[PDB]
Protein backbone atom coordinates (compact mmCIF):
# COMPACT_ATOMS: atom_id res chain seq x y z
CA UNK A 1 0.00 0.00 0.00
CA UNK A 2 1.41 3.50 -0.85
CA UNK A 3 -0.35 6.52 0.85
CA UNK A 4 0.39 10.15 -0.19
CA UNK A 5 1.97 12.54 2.36
CA UNK A 6 -0.74 15.24 2.91
CA UNK A 7 -4.27 13.99 2.01
CA UNK A 8 -5.82 17.28 3.36
CA UNK A 9 -9.57 16.48 3.15
CA UNK A 10 -11.51 14.41 5.80
CA UNK A 11 -13.97 11.80 4.37
CA UNK A 12 -17.18 13.44 5.73
CA UNK A 13 -19.15 10.10 5.90
Cα–Cα separations (whole angstroms), residue 9 to 1, 6, 12, 13: 19, 9, 9, 12
Please tell me the experimental approach by which this structure was elucidated.
NMR
Secondary structure of the chain in the HEC alphabet? Answer: CCCCCCCCCCCCC
Interatomic CA distance for residues 12 and 3, integer angstroms: 19
> What is d(CA 2, CA 9) in angstroms, rounded to the nearest whole number?
17
On the CB side of 11, CA atoms within 13 Å amount to 2
Instruction: Round to whole Å and give the CA distance between 13 and 1.
Output: 22
Amino acid sequence: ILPWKWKWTPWRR
